[PDB]
Design a protein around this nucleic acid. Structure first.
Lengths: 59, 64
DNA sequence: AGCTGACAGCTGTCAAG
DNA sequence: TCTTGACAGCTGTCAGC
């Protein structure tokens, strides 16, 4: 349900936008389609990533 | 924005809320029952109770 | 002239791998 | 077996009555 291929595609986007890790709705659409994820999965992933990757990198 | 809030909905939701003040958290079965009775979506029902908890229930307790 | 429905993102949490 | 995708409910906030 969560393709293992999705993770590195999503991380690539995240680590390339660390200063503003909030994809636009169009960016979410692209990421969803490219990863094989749903919009909900993409949204939840970035919520989790921001508190588990992005914030800890600043702390 | 093509959504609607049916006229009958407000008082049906209020009736449920004020009859369950000690635990204003409908079960999933109660939620779909309310959706049927009001003509609201499950999402609308969920959002309604989130708003009512902080705008009705909590303020009543603050004065309590 | 707010109320209030609505929604993007956050919090707290947990099953399952 | 500790990590992480997932989700019920919460926070912050806006826009049209």
């Amino acid at each position: 349900i969560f393709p293992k291929v999705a993770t590195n595609i999503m991380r690539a986007w995240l680590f390339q936008h660390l200063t503003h890790p909030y994809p636009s709705e169009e960016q979410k659409k692209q990421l969803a389609q490219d990863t094989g994820l749903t919009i909900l999965q993409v949204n939840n992933w970035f919520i989790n990533a921001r508190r588990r990757i992005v914030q800890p990198m600043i702390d």
